[PDB]
């Protein structure tokens, strides 16, 4: 009965190819989960990064504005001194 | 939480930007009151 | 022909099962990647916390600098006015 054996093997090949199809669909679901998860976390993080660099550029300009403010006040002491 | 503590830094930074101008004008105002 | 056919079917079954094992390996690698991708985003957030600390420290120094500036201009102006 290599004829019954052939029918068995056809069944087993159908079950294996079905299994493959399903596992491939699973893989695709994981790849989609990865993509969705990365897009979300990037959103969050790009926001936090924007806020950080804004803070940084501002505080830089405030170092400047502090020197400059001290300079302005000093020129005011210069004038006050002319008296 | 970072969104948030980045905005405490942010708020305090802006208040300080204010204080700089407050001080400079306060001084100029006082000096010119002396002339 | 039942003999040739058995042999062909066994080769095909073997190739299907090898393929299924590789696709399961790939699924496993994607599952591990979801983990690693999570860790990476975390590490990004730690970098961000470092930036926020540097900025708080700078801000604080600028606040102290303004205070010190005011104090010493108050003494300067006091003596310029004691005249």
Residue numbers in the entry:
A (entry chain C), C (entry chain B): 552 to 634
B (entry chain A): 419 to 453
Would you copy out the relevant sentences from the publication that reported this structure?
In this process, small GTPase Rab5 functions as a master regulator of the early endosomal biogenesis. Rabex-5 is a specific GEF for Rab5, Rab17, and Rab21. Rabaptin-5 is a key effector of Rab5 and plays an important role in both homotypic and heterotypic fusions of early endosomes. The GEF activity of Rabex-5 is autoinhibited by its CC domain and is activated by the binding of Rabaptin-5 via its C2-1 domain.
In the structure of the Rabex-5CC-Rabaptin-5C212 complex, the asymmetric unit contains one complex. Rabex-5CC also forms a long α-helix (52 Å) and packs in parallel with the C-terminal regions of Rabaptin-5C212 to form a tight three-helix bundle. The interactions between Rabex-5CC and Rabaptin-5C212 are essentially the same as those in the R2Δ complex. Interestingly, Rabaptin-5C212 assumes a linear conformation in the Rabex-5CC-Rabaptin-5C212 structure but a V-shaped conformation in the R2Δ structure, and in both structures, the C-terminal regions of Rabaptin-5C212 bind one Rabex-5CC and two symmetry-related Rabaptin-5C212 dimerize through the N-terminal regions which are the binding site for GAT.
